[PDB]
Symmetry: D2
Subunit: 380 residues, 4 copies
Amino acid sequence: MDFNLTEDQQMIKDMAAEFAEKFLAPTVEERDKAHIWDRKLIDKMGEAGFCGICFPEEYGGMGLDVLSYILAVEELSKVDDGTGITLSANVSLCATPIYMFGTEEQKQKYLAPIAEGTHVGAFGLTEPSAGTDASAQQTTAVLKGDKYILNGSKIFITNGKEADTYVVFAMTDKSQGVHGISAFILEKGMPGFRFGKIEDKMGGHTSITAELIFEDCEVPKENLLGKEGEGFKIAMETLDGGRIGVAAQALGIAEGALAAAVKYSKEREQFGRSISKFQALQFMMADMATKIEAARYLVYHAAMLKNEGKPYSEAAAMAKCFASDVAMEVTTDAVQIFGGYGYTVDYPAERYMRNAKITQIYEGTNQVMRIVTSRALLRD
Amino acid sequence: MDFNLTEDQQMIKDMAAEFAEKFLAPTVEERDKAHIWDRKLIDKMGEAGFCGICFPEEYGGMGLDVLSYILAVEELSKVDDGTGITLSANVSLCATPIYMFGTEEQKQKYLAPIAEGTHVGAFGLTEPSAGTDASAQQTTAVLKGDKYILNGSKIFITNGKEADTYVVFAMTDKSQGVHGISAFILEKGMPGFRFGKIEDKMGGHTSITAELIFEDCEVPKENLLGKEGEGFKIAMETLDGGRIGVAAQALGIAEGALAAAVKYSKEREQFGRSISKFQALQFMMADMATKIEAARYLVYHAAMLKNEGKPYSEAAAMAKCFASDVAMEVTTDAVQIFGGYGYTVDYPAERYMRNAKITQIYEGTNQVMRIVTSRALLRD
Amino acid sequence: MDFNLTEDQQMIKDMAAEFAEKFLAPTVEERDKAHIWDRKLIDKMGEAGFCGICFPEEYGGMGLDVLSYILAVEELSKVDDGTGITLSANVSLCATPIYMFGTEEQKQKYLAPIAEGTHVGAFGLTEPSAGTDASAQQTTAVLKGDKYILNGSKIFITNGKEADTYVVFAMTDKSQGVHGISAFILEKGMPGFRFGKIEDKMGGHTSITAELIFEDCEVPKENLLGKEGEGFKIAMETLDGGRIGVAAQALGIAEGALAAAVKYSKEREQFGRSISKFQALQFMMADMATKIEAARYLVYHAAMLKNEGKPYSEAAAMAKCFASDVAMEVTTDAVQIFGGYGYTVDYPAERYMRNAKITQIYEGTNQVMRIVTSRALLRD
Amino acid sequence: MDFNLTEDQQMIKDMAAEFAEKFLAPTVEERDKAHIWDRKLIDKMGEAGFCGICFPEEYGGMGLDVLSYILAVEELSKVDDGTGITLSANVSLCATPIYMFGTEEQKQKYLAPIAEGTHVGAFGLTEPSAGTDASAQQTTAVLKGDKYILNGSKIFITNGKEADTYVVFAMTDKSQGVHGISAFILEKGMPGFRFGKIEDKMGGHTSITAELIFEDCEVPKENLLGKEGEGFKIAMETLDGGRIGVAAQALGIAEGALAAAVKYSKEREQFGRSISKFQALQFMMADMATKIEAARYLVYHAAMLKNEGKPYSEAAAMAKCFASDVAMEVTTDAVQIFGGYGYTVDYPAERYMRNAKITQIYEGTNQVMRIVTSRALLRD
Ligand SMILES: Cc1cc2nc3c(=O)[nH]c(=O)nc-3n(C[C@H](O)[C@H](O)[C@H](O)COP(=O)(O)OP(=O)(O)OC[C@H]3O[C@@H](n4cnc5c(N)ncnc54)[C@H](O)[C@@H]3O)c2cc1C
Ligand SMILES: Cc1cc2nc3c(=O)[nH]c(=O)nc-3n(C[C@H](O)[C@H](O)[C@H](O)COP(=O)(O)OP(=O)(O)OC[C@H]3O[C@@H](n4cnc5c(N)ncnc54)[C@H](O)[C@@H]3O)c2cc1C
Ligand SMILES: Cc1cc2nc3c(=O)[nH]c(=O)nc-3n(C[C@H](O)[C@H](O)[C@H](O)COP(=O)(O)OP(=O)(O)OC[C@H]3O[C@@H](n4cnc5c(N)ncnc54)[C@H](O)[C@@H]3O)c2cc1C
Ligand SMILES: Cc1cc2nc3c(=O)[nH]c(=O)nc-3n(C[C@H](O)[C@H](O)[C@H](O)COP(=O)(O)OP(=O)(O)OC[C@H]3O[C@@H](n4cnc5c(N)ncnc54)[C@H](O)[C@@H]3O)c2cc1C
Ligand SMILES: CC(C)(COP(=O)(O)OP(=O)(O)OC[C@H]1O[C@@H](n2cnc3c(N)ncnc32)[C@H](O)[C@@H]1OP(=O)(O)O)[C@@H](O)C(=O)NCCC(=O)NCCSS
Ligand SMILES: CC(C)(COP(=O)(O)OP(=O)(O)OC[C@H]1O[C@@H](n2cnc3c(N)ncnc32)[C@H](O)[C@@H]1OP(=O)(O)O)[C@@H](O)C(=O)NCCC(=O)NCCSS
Ligand SMILES: CC(C)(COP(=O)(O)OP(=O)(O)OC[C@H]1O[C@@H](n2cnc3c(N)ncnc32)[C@H](O)[C@@H]1OP(=O)(O)O)[C@@H](O)C(=O)NCCC(=O)NCCSS
Ligand SMILES: CC(C)(COP(=O)(O)OP(=O)(O)OC[C@H]1O[C@@H](n2cnc3c(N)ncnc32)[C@H](O)[C@@H]1OP(=O)(O)O)[C@@H](O)C(=O)NCCC(=O)NCCSS
Ligand code: NA
Ligand code: NA
Ligand code: NA
Ligand code: NA
Ligand code: NA
Ligand code: NA
C-alpha cells in the first residue's frame, strides 16, 4: 500500500486547481446566479487537456491514468461542480463508451475530438418511463437501408442541447427486452434530432440539462456502437465509471463547503471570540473533515481498480453512495456554520448545499447504489 | 391528557386549510419562482382574521387560544411557508410584545391594526455584530426632548420594508450591557428610518427579509415599549413564542413534503409497480411520517404551555430544534423519492427542501436551541 | 388538547415511582448481575395493584385507564425494566386477550387472578420457524373429545416457565393458513406442558425468557379462546397493545439512562470543571432529552387512542419504533458520558444500554413496525 | 497510489487469520462467557511472533512494517477482539515507547522479551482524577539514592496484573504541571507494586483490565524512560499509535459482525425466502459494508503515515473516531439482523456489540478524537 499520489497525479491535481482558480472562481457566483453554461469556458477546459487525461495519446489524450482524471473532477468541483459534471459527462459518459466499444474509425472520429477538447459529449439513456428501470427503453431504432431511423426522446441529459456528440440508447428488438437495446453515436445537427426542454433545477445551475427528441431521426448505420443488442451492457459499464465521476464531484463539493466554513469560522466572532472557539462547532467541523477523508479513499480506490483492469462496479457504487451522502450532510452543516449569512447567495454555502442534493440522484440514485452493493455483498 | 383538538382549534385549522387551498396553492409555484411577496395576498390573510386569532376581541382579535394560531401557521406552511412565516412574524414577533408590554394606548394604536389585518409587523433585533450574541447591540437610542433619536441598523428582518410597524431594540445605556437595552415601536415612514438590502436567499422566496437603517431616526418618547433597560427581556420573551411559530412552520413544511412524496410514490411506476411497492422507500416514508408525528406534539405542547401561562421557553426551544431538524431530513428524502423530477422546479419537493434549511437558523439557531435546552436540563 | 395528566394518572405514576424506589432500586444491580427473576418481588408488584390498573373492578382491577397503566410500566422501567416487561407481558400480552376475547367464565377464572396480582401471565406465539412470519405456525391443536391435544413448542417467551397462565397459538386447520390458527389458555402444570431452555441473553437479565414444549398436551376444550380460526386476529390485536408497553419500557430505560448521565455529568470533574460544562456533552444531553420528549407523546397518544376505543395499531407501531430507537441511541451516549466508568457494571449505564437493544426486537422488530406504519401511510 | 497489500502484509494477514481460526475461534464463546484471559493462549500468540512484527530483528522482532502489525490486530479482532486489544496494548502501548525512547540496554532488557513473545506489557497513565485530563497526574515519583520511590495508583489498565512489564507515568515535579511528568519501566513483582480491582465490564470479557497500586514502590533509577519531565510527550506519542490499534480493533469487530450477519441472512428464512431477500435488510447490510470500507482506509492510512515517519496524530484520531463509531453502528444493526436470536449469547452478535462500545471510549474517548481533529483542522 501506498497512499501517496504519483508525480503525474499530483501534477494533474495542481493543473486543475490552477485552472479552477484562474477561470472558474472569479465567475462562478455570477454564472450560478444567472444560470449560465458558458461554452467558451468549457472550451478553455478542453483546451487545457482535462478531457483527455485518461485516454491514449493515439486518440488525442495525455496517456495518463483514471485517478488523475478523477482528481481533476474533484478539484474543479471544489470551486464549480457545474463545470465538474460537464467534464465528467464528457469523459466518463460519452468518450469512455466510444473508447471501450467503438471501432477504430469511430474512435478517431468521435473520441479524439473530445479528448482534444473540441467537442462536448453527452449520454442519452433516461426516458420519461425509464429512469431507475433503465432497461424499459421505448425509443426505437429501425434499420432502413444505410440508416437507422430513431424515434423517441430522452430527458435530463447532462450537456444536452450544447453537446456535439451523443451516445444514445434505443430498442432495436423490443421482444428481446434488455437484450434488445443498442447504442448509437449521434451528432448535433443530424436530421430529425432536436432538443426540447432545458430543465430549471434546484441547483447545478452551471450545468446544462436538456431533453433530446428524435423524430424519424436518421442515424448512419455505421454509427451503431458495439453490436446490436449490446446496448444495455454498454450503458451499465459506462455508468460504473460515471459513478466514480459523480463520487468525485460530491467529494469536491464537500471539500469546498468545509473549506469555506473553516475559513468563515475562524473570522466570524460572537461573544468576543471566533465561532471556531465553540466546542459544538469544532466537533461539527471535525465530523465533516472525517467523513470527507473517509469518502476520499473510496473514490480513489474505485478509480484505481478501474485503472488496474479489475472489477470496480461495487467499488464505484460504494464511493458514489457514500460521497454523495457525505456531501449532503457536510453542505447542510456548512450552511449552518455561516448562520443567517449562509442562507444568502452572497456567501458560498447555499450553492454547495443545493448542488449536493443532485449527487444523490443522478448516475443512478443512491437506492440503486445500495442495490448494486447489496447484490455484490450477498452473492454466492 | 387529551390529544383531541377543541372545536375552536379544528375550526381554525379548517379555515386555514381553506384559505391556503383558495389563495395560496394556485400561485405559490409562480410566486416562489419570481421571488414575490404579494402585499395584497398578505392583506387577504389579515382580512380573513389570521393575525388576530389569539388576541382579545377588545384589540380587534378573535379571542381564541395560542394553539389555534399555531395550527394556522402549520396549515399555511404545508402550502406556502413564506406566507406562514409572514404571519408568524406579524403575530409572534410584533403583535405579541406590544400585547404583552404595551400600554393600553399603544395596544389600541399598534396591536389592533395588526389583529384586524391591515398592518404588517416586524421585529428588529439582529445586527451585523449581534446575531447569536443578541445582547451585543450597537444600535443606540438617545432621548432628546420628546423624541428618542436612534442610530444603527438591523439585518435579516422578516417582513422588513413591507411592514408597517416594527418593534426594534437599541442601547439606551451601553455601560449596563444586557441591562441597557430598550424596545421601541417604530412606524414605516418615520424620518431617518429607511431600508437597505433585501436579501436574495437560498429559499423563503415568498418571504421578505430586509436590512433596517436608522440615521438620526426620530421616535416619539411615548413609543418606548416597556421600561428603559427592559429590552432584552422583551426580546427573549418574544423569541420564546416565536420559536413555536418557527417550529409550526417547520412542521408544515415537513408535512407538505411528505404528502407530496406519498402521493407521487403511489402514482410513479418503475419495474412494473408503483415505487411505493419497494421496501426501502416504504421504510423511508414510515420514518418521515413518524418523525413528523413526534415533532407535532412537541410543537402543540409548547403552544399549550404558553396558553396556560406556564413556563414554555425550554419547550419551545425543543420543539423548534426538533421540528426544524425533522423538516430538513424529511424534505431532503422527499426530493429523493421524486428522483430526477425532484431536483426540478416543476415539482414541489425542491422548494420544501430549500425552505426547510432556514428553519434551523432563524429565531435562534439550533445550536442556541441546544444551549437553552441544556441549560434547563443541567440547572442547579 | 390537554397535555396534563389526570389526577388518577398522576397518582398511578407516583405509586409506581414509590414502588420502584422501595422495592426495585435497592436490589436491581444485584439481581441483574446474578440474572435473577425474583417471584416474591413480582408478587409484591401484583399485590400493589399494577397488574390490574386498566381492568374493570368486576374482573379484579382498579377500573382506571390505559395511560395510567402505561405510566406505571414507564416508571418501573426507569429503574428495572426487567420488572417493567414482566408487568407488560402480564397485562398487555396475557390478561388483555383474555379480557378482550374471553367468555365470562374465562375472565373470572384467568383474568381476575392476574388483575388481583396472584398469577403471572405469558403469551406463546413465536416458534423456531415463525418469528416475524408469525402466521407460519407449526404447533398443532387437534380436538379429541373434551380436549384439544397440542403438539409443538414456543421459543423466547417472556415470563415463560414461571408464569401461571399462558395464551398460546396453534394451528387447528393448516389448510386455512392464517385463518387456521386458534388461541388457547394454558395452565402451568397441565399434562404434557413443560419448559425447555431458559435463554441467556445480552441483557434483560431480570426478565425470564423460556421455551414452552407441548407433547400431547391436553387442553380442555373450553380453554379455546375466541372461535376456532380467530387466533391470528387475537395475536395481532394483542401485539398492537403490547407494542405500547414496549414503547413505555423503552421510554423509561431512556429516561433512567439520561437521568443517570445528567447527575454524573454534574458531579464528575475533568480540567477543573464539571464535565457538564463542556459544550459537546451539553449538546449530546440536550439531544437525548429532546428525543425522549418526542418519544413520550407518541407513546401517550397510542395509549389514549386505545383507551378511547379508536384505531391505535399505527400509533402503537410508531411509538414502539421511535421509543426503542431513542432508547438505543440515548443509552449508547449515556455510557459515553460516564467514560471508562460507564463500561463497568459498578455504574448503571451499561445495564440500560444492554437492555435497550431488545426493545428494538421483541413484540415485533422495528422492521415490522415500519411495515405496519408504511402500510397505514400508503393505504388508499 | 496503490491499494494493494505488499507480500509481507498479505503473509501476516494470512498468518493472523490462521492463528485466529486454530486458536481463538474454537474457544472464544466459552472464554467470553467465563470472562477468561488465558495467559497460555496469549503466550501462543507471542510465540507465533505477533508481538514482534513491527520491531527490528536486533530486538527480537520480524523487522516488518506498521501496517503488517495493524492487519494482524484487525484479523484477530474479527474473531476475538479481547485478544486483539491484548496484542495492541503489548505492542503499541508498552513495547513501542520502550523502542522509541529507551536506551539500548532498556530495549534489550524490556523490549526484546515482548517482541519475542514471553512477556506481556501494559501502559499505566489513567488515574481516578486524570482520565481525559491526562496531564492531571497525582502519582508521584521521588528519587532517593539509586531508586525512584513511587506512590499513587492507576485505573483501567489493559493487561494489568497479568502483564510482566509496565510503562507508567508519575509526577517528578508537580509545580511544572504537564512538564513535570516522567515515564518509568516497572516490573511485576517490584516491592510496593500491587494490583487492585479487576474490572467487571459490559464487554471485553477476554481482555483484562486492572487497577495498579504503588505504595512506596521501589523503581531502579535506570528504569526512568526518557528524560525527567518528558513523560507527557512519551504518553501522547504512544497514544497516537495506540489509536491506530484501537481503530484496527474496531474495524475487525465490525467486519466480524457484518460477516456473521451476512451469513445468517442467507440461511435464515421467513415468508418463504431468505431474509437477505428483503430490501430494507439488503440496504442495511450495504450501508454496513460501505461504512466498513470507508473506515478501513482511514486505519491503513494512519498506519502507513506512521511507517513513513510522517505526522500521523490527526490521521490516527480520525481513524479511531470513525472506525469505533462504525463498529458501534454496525454491531447494533448486526444484532438486529439476527432478530431474537441476536439478543442471545448462543449467537455471536451480542458479543460484538458489547465489545464495540469500549472502542469509543478507550485510548481517548471519541470526544478527545474530535478535539485532536478539530485542533488540526482549525490550526493557525
Ligand atoms: C440534473 C440531472 C442530470 C441528469 N443527467 C443524466 C444524463 O446525463 N444522462 C442520463 O441518461 N440520465 C440523466 N439523468 C436522469 C437520472 O439518472 C435519473 O433521474 C435517475 O436514474 C432516477 O430516475 P427517475 O428520475 O426516473 O426516478 P425513478 O426511477 O422514478 O425513481 C424515483 C425514486 O424511486 C426509487 N426507486 C426506483 N426504483 C427502486 C427500486 N427498485 N428500489 C428502491 N427504490 C427505487 C429511486 O431511487 C427514487 O428515489 C439526470 C437527472 C438529473 C436530475
Ligand atoms: C431569513 C432570515 C430571517 C430572519 N429574520 C429575522 C427577524 O425577523 N428578526 C431578527 O431580529 N433577526 C432575524 N434573523 C437573523 C437570525 O436570527 C440570525 O441569523 C441567527 O440568530 C444567527 O445569527 P447570525 O446569522 O449572526 O450567525 P452567528 O451568530 O454568527 O452564528 C454563526 C454560527 O455559529 C454558531 N454559534 C454562535 N454562537 C455559538 C455558541 N455560543 N455556541 C455554539 N455555536 C454558536 C451559530 O449557531 C451558527 O451556526 C433572520 C435571519 C434570516 C437568515
Ligand atoms: C427477550 C425476548 C423476549 C421475547 N418475548 C416473546 C414473548 O413473550 N412472546 C412471543 O411470542 N415472542 C417473544 N419473542 C420473540 C420475538 O418477538 C421475535 O424474536 C421477533 O418477532 C423476531 O423474530 P425472529 O427472532 O424469528 O427474527 P426473524 O423474523 O428471523 O427476523 C430476523 C431479521 O429479519 C428481519 N425481517 C424479517 N422479515 C422481514 C420482512 N418481511 N421485511 C424486512 N425485514 C424482515 C427482522 O426484522 C429481523 O431484523 C421474544 C424475543 C426475545 C428476544
Ligand atoms: C476497558 C478499559 C481499558 C482501558 N485501558 C487503559 C490502559 O490500558 N491504560 C490507560 O492508561 N488507560 C486505560 N483506560 C482509561 C481510558 O482511557 C479512560 O477511561 C478515558 O480516557 C476516559 O477517561 P475517564 O474514564 O476518566 O472519563 P472522563 O475523562 O471523566 O470523561 C467522561 C466524559 O466526559 C467527556 N469529556 C471529558 N473531557 C471533555 C472535554 N474537554 N470536552 C468534551 N468532552 C469531554 C469524555 O469524552 C467522556 O464522555 C481504559 C479504560 C477502559 C474502560
Ligand atoms: C437497477 C439496475 C442496477 C439493475 O436493473 P435490472 O433491471 O435489475 O437489471 P439486471 O437484471 O441487474 O441486469 C440485466 C443485464 O445487464 C447486465 N448488467 C447489469 N449491471 C452490469 C454491469 N455493471 N456491467 C455489465 N453488465 C451489467 C446483467 O448482467 C444482465 O445481463 P445478462 O442477463 O446478459 O447477464 C440498473 O437498471 C440501473 O443501474 N439503473 C440506474 C440507471 C442509471 O444509473 N441511470 C443514470 C443515467 S446518467 S445520470
Ligand atoms: C444565546 C442566548 C440564549 C443567551 O445569551 P447570553 O448572552 O448567554 O444571555 P443570558 O446570560 O442567558 O441572559 C442575559 C439576561 O437575559 C435574560 N434571559 C435570557 N433568556 C430569557 C428568557 N427566555 N426570558 C426572560 N429573560 C431571559 C437572563 O435571565 C439574563 O437576565 P438577568 O441578568 O437580569 O438575570 C440568547 O442571546 C439568544 O437566544 N440568542 C439567539 C437570538 C435569536 O434567537 N435571534 C433571533 C432573531 S428573530 S429571527
Ligand atoms: C408481518 C406482520 C405485520 C404481517 O404479517 P402478514 O403475513 O403480512 O399478515 P397480513 O397479511 O398483514 O395479515 C393477515 C391477516 O391478519 C389480519 N391482521 C393483521 N394485523 C392486524 C391487526 N392489527 N388487527 C387485526 N387483524 C390484523 C389481516 O387483516 C389479515 O386478516 P384477514 O385476511 O382476515 O383480513 C405480522 O406477521 C407481525 O406482526 N409479525 C411480527 C410478530 C410479532 O410482533 N411477534 C411478537 C411476539 S411477543 S415479543
Ligand atoms: C485532551 C488531550 C488531547 C489534550 O490535553 P491538554 O491538557 O489540552 O494538553 P495540550 O495542551 O494539548 O498539550 C500539553 C503538552 O502536551 C503536548 N502534546 C499533546 N499532544 C501531543 C502529541 N500527539 N505529541 C506530542 N506532544 C503532544 C503539547 O504539545 C503540550 O506540550 P508543550 O506545552 O511542551 O508544547 C490529551 O490530554 C489526551 O489525549 N487525553 C486523552 C488521554 C487518553 O487518550 N487516555 C488513554 C489511556 S490508554 S486507554
Ligand atoms: Na436511467
Ligand atoms: Na452561494
Ligand atoms: Na387523537
Ligand atoms: Na412472533
Ligand atoms: Na450497570
Ligand atoms: Na485493491
